[PDB]
Design a binder for this molecule. Structure first.
Ligand SMILES: Cc1cn2c(C)c([C@H](OC(C)(C)C)C(=O)O)c(N3CCC(C)(C)CC3)c(-c3ccc(OCCc4ccc(F)cc4)cc3)c2n1
Ligand SMILES: Cc1cn2c(C)c([C@H](OC(C)(C)C)C(=O)O)c(N3CCC(C)(C)CC3)c(-c3ccc(OCCc4ccc(F)cc4)cc3)c2n1
Lengths: 140, 140
């Protein structure tokens, strides 16, 4: 459970938001990209694995599961690349937060990082940021 | 101590590498940018604070300390913006790792994230990644 993450992809303003969800805590990392490609997904996973102890990733679709570039990043970072409700509600929640801050940000990427901040600090009482740290520290 | 970070800027291949160091653990986050600007620093701090509980940031120089854009990001994210050896040795260590992986990466940003991965997982026995999680979980 502590090393399991789920990839998720959603569209907004003609752009793609790639999200990594830490399944046990609900903690997220997200980035805005022009379109989902194997190279963008591979780079996102390399970043995530250098920051958190990523053991397994459930890919968001069969193209990212199949991608030789994604498989190479998973090999490099020591990640077990795996296949495939609450994710749909999290995409809706993220878009809701983005809408609420959209006026404070000129760039979509700024609004997305503001939403990541709000989601991870929301007490619902522990926050997702507190839960991920507690889950991983117990495993050490 | 658990919420204290230090910004650091270094040059490589006509580009700038912006680094955030968690002082107590030695854990790092890094990004490649064309040049250090208030907007790039503000965006980097917004990302960092959505991922880790950032209480204080020691800015890397007086321009980032003065920047109204950096001060706005610190205000938004609830960060106390503060002023100003081992950092010089960490820039040298990071460049050394980048040199060792440079042949496996076409893009400089790929090599930088590989170096972040290696630095954070290096056991020296706990790693910086284990130390940051343990330090923050004790504070919760
Ligand atoms: C020119 C330009 C572009 N520009 C742009 C592009 C942005 C944003 O992009 C990045 C993140 C900088 C790339 C954006 O996408 O909108 C920006 N932001 C600053 C940081 C933020 C508050 C997290 C989001 C808004 C400012 C700005 C700079 C000074 C501001 O000062 C407000 C009074 C004040 C309050 C508290 C303080 F402590 C100090 C000042 C406000 C907005 C800006 N300015
Ligand atoms: C066309 C192109 C650009 N391109 C580029 C730009 C890159 C790198 O950029 C990003 C990170 C993708 C934007 C780069 O900056 O170099 C890249 N990398 C993949 C991930 C990495 C191993 C973390 C770094 C190298 C590959 C590639 C793709 C398949 C590879 O397969 C190697 C046999 C194999 C081993 C284990 C496996 F499980 C599966 C395959 C090797 C390299 C690539 N390809």
């Amino acid at each position: 459970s502590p090393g399991i993450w789920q990839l998720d992809c959603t569209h907004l303003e003609g752009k793609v938001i790639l999200v990594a969800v830490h399944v046990a805590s609900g903690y997220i990392e997200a980035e805005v990209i022009p379109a989902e490609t194997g190279q963008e997904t591979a780079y996102f996973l390399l970043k995530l694995a250098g920051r958190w102890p990523v053991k397994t990733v459930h890919t968001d679709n069969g193209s990212n599961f199949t991608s030789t570039t994604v498989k190479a990043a998973c090999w490099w970072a020591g990640i077990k690349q795996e296949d495939g409700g609450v994710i749909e509600s999290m995409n809706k929640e993220l878009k809701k937060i983005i809408g609420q801050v959209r006026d404070q940000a000129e760039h979509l990427k700024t609004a997305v990082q503001m939403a990541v901040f709000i989601h991870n600090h929301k007490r619902k009482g522990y926050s997702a940021g507190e839960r991920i740290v507690d889950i991983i520290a117990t495993d050490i």
